[PDB]
């Protein structure tokens, strides 16, 4: 199931929905989590915190089913709103979702 991108809420951006599964069985080998490293508590120039992908394992789920790259801002993790949450916040969000066999992350390009 590929990912899709629909018009943002401002009509000037594209917000797609990315679904990742921590099955750990990508074509590469086993991986570890889903396929990309994310960061939290990244205070932007707007005045709010968010999440950013530090890196993506070429071949992992996040790459094949997600299709993103380090630098993308994920305003949604596991169907939860991250905007406003700091590094410690995201930590709880993701970690809590790290146990789930499926995840839903959204970004903004």
């Amino acid at each position: 199931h590929p990912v899709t991108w629909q018009p943002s809420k401002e009509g000037d951006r594209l917000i797609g929905r990315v679904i990742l599964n921590k099955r750990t069985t990508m074509p590469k080998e086993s991986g570890a989590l889903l396929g990309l490293k994310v960061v939290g508590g990244k205070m932007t120039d707007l005045g709010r915190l968010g999440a950013f992908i530090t890196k993506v394992k070429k071949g992992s789920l996040a790459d094949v089913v997600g299709h993103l790259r380090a630098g993308d801002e994920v305003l949604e993790w596991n169907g939860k709103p991250l905007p406003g949450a700091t590094n410690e916040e995201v930590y709880n969000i993701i970690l809590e979702s790290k146990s789930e066999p499926q995840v839903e992350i959204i970004v903004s390009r």
């Binding site: 990742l20 889903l34 396929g35 996040a62 995201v90």
Partner: peptide, 6 residues
């Protein structure tokens, strides 16, 4: 600069 492993 990291945060969580995914």
């Amino acid at each position: 600069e990291e945060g969580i492993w995914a």
